[PDB]
Amino acid sequence: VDMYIERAGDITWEKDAETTDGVYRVMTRRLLGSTQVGVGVMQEGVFHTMWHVTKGAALRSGEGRLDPYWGDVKQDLVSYCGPWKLDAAWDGLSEVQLLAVPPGERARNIQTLPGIFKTKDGDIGAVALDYPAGTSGSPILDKCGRVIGLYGNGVVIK
Amino acid sequence: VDMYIERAGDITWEKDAEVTGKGETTDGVYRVMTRRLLGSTQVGVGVMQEGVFHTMWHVTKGAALRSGEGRLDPYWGDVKQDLVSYCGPWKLDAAWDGLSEVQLLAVPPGERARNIQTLPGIFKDGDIGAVALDYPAGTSGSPILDKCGRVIGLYGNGVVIKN
């Protein structure tokens, strides 16, 4: 019962909607087959995903193995091979694109204006879209194609 | 790490279902939920029986659960077998005869409980049976029942053969 990752596609802004950079599916092997538990972003030799998806478990890309470097359960984030590199943020005004990677389906971008929330430590943005269980961790992009958040977690405001 | 559990239904053998070609510790099937910043998410499923909650080790990773106002502490756990018990020893002692059909009382995320008859395949320490069915991530730990309604295995893990 060891987790692994397969590449799902490139991280680009669709203008009209190893450790290679891109979006990957976080898969887990049961007895008779596999199941997608989440999604993650590989960037600058560091894999990023949500903590609940992997629960700090070691991943596997090809013959090699990726060990977890940092993790925060409160924020529900985890990083592999290095520190958290997704430093981009949402301006809290313009539309964003959810590069959703649902289980057993191709990657697809979707423009949408995320809502606003009244959480404790300031306000946070969120994508009001519905997707299957293992879609968590899918990247949320800005006009520049930079990852400003992960589906499931809120999109940090500037 | 604030996991909790909500009841999903009773553990019964639906006599004519689909066929394939503490605060509260009431017996039944429960969803193992984790509460994030913007909502919750189902990470697995478990069986409450004889005042003991049973689930898969990978689902909770030995973490403490919460049922109502009360809290459930883990009593036993084996990562190799991928099993964990809360409040007491493992009580699911039933086994599959390795011949008759069984029912997977699946509890998928954001969906009602549903039974499914199916004849599990066989494998070769000893031999083990397995349910060749596909379900979303958080469905792991769903109980596998026999004609009598006794839990003979958990979805994800194999169904132990009469040994």
From Swiss-Prot, chain B:
Mod. after translation: Acetylated by host KAT5. Acetylation modulates NS3 RNA-binding and unwinding activities and plays an important positive role for viral replication.
Q: How does it sit in the membrane?
A: Peripheral membrane protein
Signal peptide location: none
Location in or out of the cell: Host cytoplasm; Host endoplasmic reticulum membrane
Residues forming the Peptidase S7 domain are: 22-163
The active site is formed by: 58, 82, 140
What is this protein's function? Displays three enzymatic activities: serine protease, NTPase and RNA helicase. NS3 serine protease, in association with NS2B, performs its autocleavage and cleaves the polyprotein at dibasic sites in the cytoplasm: C-prM, NS2A-NS2B, NS2B-NS3, NS3-NS4A, NS4A-2K and NS4B-NS5. NS3 RNA helicase binds RNA and unwinds dsRNA in the 3' to 5' direction. Leads to translation arrest when expressed ex vivo. Disrupts host centrosome organization in a CEP63-dependent manner to degrade host TBK1 and inhibits innate immune response. Inhibits the integrated stress response (ISR) in the infected cell.
Q: How does it assemble?
A: Forms a heterodimer with NS2B. Interacts with NS4B. Interacts with unphosphorylated RNA-directed RNA polymerase NS5; this interaction stimulates RNA-directed RNA polymerase NS5 guanylyltransferase activity. Interacts with non-structural protein 2A. Interacts with host SHFL; this interaction promotes NS3 degradation via a lysosome-dependent pathway. Interacts with host CEP63; this interaction disorganizes the centrosome and inhibits host innate immune response.
What protein name applies here?
A: Serine protease NS3
Organism for this UniProt entry: Zika virus (ZIKV)
